[model samples]
Target: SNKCDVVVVGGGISGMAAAKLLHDSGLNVVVLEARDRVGGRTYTLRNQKVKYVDLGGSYVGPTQNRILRLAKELGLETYKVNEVERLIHHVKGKSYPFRGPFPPVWNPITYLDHNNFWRTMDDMGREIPSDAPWKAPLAEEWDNMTMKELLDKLCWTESAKQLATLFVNLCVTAETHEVSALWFLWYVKQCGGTTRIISTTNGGQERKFVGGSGQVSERIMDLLGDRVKLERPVIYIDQTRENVLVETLNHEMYEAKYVISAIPPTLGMKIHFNPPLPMMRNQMITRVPLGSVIKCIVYYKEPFWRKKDYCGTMIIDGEEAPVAYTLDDTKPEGNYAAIMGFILAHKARKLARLTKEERLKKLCELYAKVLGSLEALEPVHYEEKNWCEEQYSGGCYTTYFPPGILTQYGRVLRQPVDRIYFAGTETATHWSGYMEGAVEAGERAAREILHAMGKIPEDEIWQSEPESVDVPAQPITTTFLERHLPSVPGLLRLI
Candidate 1:
């Protein structure tokens, strides 16, 4: 049996971040990870067969101060994506060259509609609360409709609507109808703004780690030593009157004063609670599901697109291929050229149903169309990571809510039930789907636990600034875990 002051039930960025903070705070913390290694969704695939690349969450921008500071602290370096002067916009088998963010082929009506959609999102973003969206003034109204419904009400033309929906698809990895409008607003607000979240310049997609994004978690685990245990998937958690008993699949047990579940809500639902969670928590888990994504990476001998004065950033708006977005992730040494793209939402779902050979053939055809060359067709290496097929993580990025879920049961999001606390990007109030959010939520959860244990001064717990954005840090102490648990019991038995 393992005994600790705190048990972090995931070795992802959030779990490791929590362990680092709690351990520094004089708490005996242990992180239990289901995978054989750390880094959760942030995975870097490296082998003789392929160039080193990240298969999961990667990239950080200027505003993502927390993750940037953390990377510096870990002694990891970063490099920006090569300057992409011109971008490609593919529609109906035709490619248009664009110098800026907007597609070049848009008509006057489409341009106006695009601006209107952005304005609408910005307006609604201001209304939604980053932490507790359910408390928004128009939460009920916004939460009751899907993003598709909101877009339809705002944009009239089919082209404008499809383009606008494409934005949401790239960001959330879900179709317009999958998530609530309120949920979209809350997510956008958390990420600063729509443009900031989507842009690579001074935005969430600005820069990537020098070696790999997984190094952040790897370095943290190196500092933790034996504190972080891998291949220990938590099967059950029994929170009794005194302490929590956590059981793993290998029949190992851990006793801890508190438990930080740093997994996605959907994955957390797999763990059986001895007494089961409250109706609201359980309902929230069921309501929040992950979006589908198949992240594909293509490697070439040289960046042929760059010689042609192409930025290698493309947005495919045609039914010719499911590739929504692609970017040049060329390695710094100029030794390798890599293009990374995502097949998202419904397209990913359909692709997942096809055989691997068929899927590869389709992808090559799409790349050929976009690149307009044989180089795109003849890649030295090709790899695709399907998040939906992953066992421990059913999907990539984060989980989102359907209509009415946020207004009804969102209050239970970060609320602690008994001795169990939640920590993940989803629970973060800022930069919720990015790596920055994972670290922020982890540190916040650590502070919460310390405050609960009477280890930290109340005022010090919530005064820390957010990872991104220039807004004043909201009073976190008052807003930390609105629900209060009963007094801690004296004794707890092992499961």
Candidate 2:
């Protein structure tokens, strides 16, 4: 009784992007989003009369990122982030505030001079040819190793290995000891930047939405009008050689020519497929892991540390929130400005296990360490959403496994088995873990469907502008200190 030319499941950036592109091409596209709201992993929660702030997908780096272009096209205002404030690195019980030219964590001055450090990583990443997959010569060797195995073989120092661990921990949301080095390398290659990448000026790499990021999707939905169906949780998808059947939670079924699953693997694994998914797909879907990254926004009466002219950047030795990064998002009155807070996956989950009040108590404790006795300045409001808790998204974004998973199982992820086409940020060839990758993957999948339906020519899809930067085999700019270091306190005033 229900039908559309094309069906897109889920309503995140990828789903919304796919729906927009397909509808633009003049196809009857139907988007089914289970939640009462859209924007998937990207959300902004409000408290009483306070302003709405992004709890997910809040930050975007200016580079080969697709989200930035889309945001601009949609006319969303953006502002440069105040990096002068960050997590001050804590090593051996001494806290070093992040200062000019010198990053608090590693103080590039000492490490940057080491040519061997940068050279080895640059050479290692070169294994995958420019803008290509590690499929050819490296494909066969994929499953044979892990990240730890490679790091051990590199003959790195304890500090070097620790640095590598920190880098992996930053991206994968998994302890370095638990993740594979190959997955780590794959992440770097996918991101198209070196670990040493940093912005020197005010126009530095980081930027965030002036309002909230969800506005991008909201505008797209406004453009679509009634095309999107809310509360329609897809229960099953039946795909045959001829057509596909999509059913909702209420037992309503719609037949379509093609199905574009914008949902991630975790949610995809949840659907019932008629001609049961191939063994490889089942394995791939089940094995692809999703861990939760929870964020707590702590409101402040004022940007307290602005007086100290400090940018907080820390790497404390102990605590669940090992890397707590905060910032001053001050805005004009009648607007909301609160310190944006961050915590790694493990610590966030551990804290969530406590009761809500208890959790807030713990956060207050953590806040005290960074800012003196902020418990009295209690946040006007606090919002929490665990990606792992959502039924549609098991948690956060996708992450690659060690060698065996990609080389062997990666083929499973890329292959279009049955009428069920796979798509999501996880399946993206470039920047798989970011929102940009999710949108890119959705576009690629739509193009695939258009070609398969004889609506488009050949396998040609969206072509990226040819651009490649050769990361030389050199550590990041050595001696950041001597290269005109600015007074940390002076820059703190900018905050």
TM-score of each: 0.92, 0.83
TM-score of 2: 0.83
| CA-lDDT, candidates in order | 0.81, 0.63
lDDT (tens digit, per residue) of candidate 2 on 1-495:
577888888888888888887888999888888888888878866546446678777666544356766777678766656655543554444555665433333444334322343445555566754333445356445346666666565533454555555545556666654555555566666665454333322212356777777887777778887778788899988776466889899777877888888887757776888788888778777676765566666566655555555543334445454344455555434245455655565776676677766756566566566554454257665565656677777777455564556655666665676555666788776767777777787788888888888888864776472321211122334354434343233334557
Off by over 4 Å in 2: 84-87, 100-119, 129-144, 148-160, 196-205, 312-323, 327-335, 371-378, 465-495
- Clash totals in order: 0, 19
Give the alpha carbon lDDT tens digit for every residue of 1-495 in model 1.
788999999988888888998988778999999999999889998876555789999888866777777777889778877656678888778787777456643465555566666756877888887878888899999999999999888885677788888888888889899899999889998887766776775566778888899998999999999988888999999986577999988889999999999999878777999888998888788888888898888878888888878878888885457688998888878767878899998888888988766766677678888878777887787778899887887787778788888889888888998888888988888898889899888888888889899887878655455453421122212112212211112111111
Per-candidate Cα RMSD to the true structure, in Å, reads: 10.9, 7.1
Top of the candidates by lDDT: 1
Q: Model 1 Cα displacement at 49 (Å)?
A: 4.2
- Residue 162 displacement in candidate 2 (angstroms): 4.0
Badly placed stretches (over 4 Å) of model 1 are 463-495
